[PDB]
């Protein structure tokens, strides 16, 4: 797989901002606050959130699109793992993952 270029990085930033602007992105903007989920960091092995992704994109952490997609997928899979399926959080992960898959298809 090819490395990310500076042009690819403009696309990553675009996709990240589209997610951050979505009405269902509210649970994911910042790292989970342990005061909202006291055992979260003992249960979730690899926490992730959109702010952490934004720091990584700004620092050109990702070498390949697969690593960016893996981090995004952690956001959604962690939320569905920690929360019950009837929670507003679980719903937000399902809607925002579908939106991310629509945007990702753009990269080809």
């Amino acid at each position: 797989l090819t490395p990310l270029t500076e042009k690819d990085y403009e696309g990553l930033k675009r996709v990240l901002r589209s997610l951050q602007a979505h009405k269902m992105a509210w649970p994911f903007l910042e790292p989970v606050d342990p005061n909202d989920a006291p055992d979260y960091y003992g249960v979730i092995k690899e926490p992730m959130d959109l702010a952490t992704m934004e720091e990584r994109v700004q620092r050109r952490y990702y070498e390949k699109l697969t690593e960016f997609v893996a981090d995004m997928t952690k956001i959604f899979d962690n939320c569905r793992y920690y929360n019950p399926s009837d929670s507003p959080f679980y719903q937000c992960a399902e809607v925002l993952e579908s939106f991310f898959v629509q945007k990702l298809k753009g990269f080809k």
């Binding site: 509210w26 005061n35 909202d36 989920a37 055992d39 979260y40 249960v43 920690y82 929360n83 019950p84 929670s87 507003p88 959080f89």
Partner: peptide
């Protein structure tokens, strides 16, 4: 594990 309400 139940998260705090928004």
């Amino acid at each position: 594990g139940a998260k705090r309400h928004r």
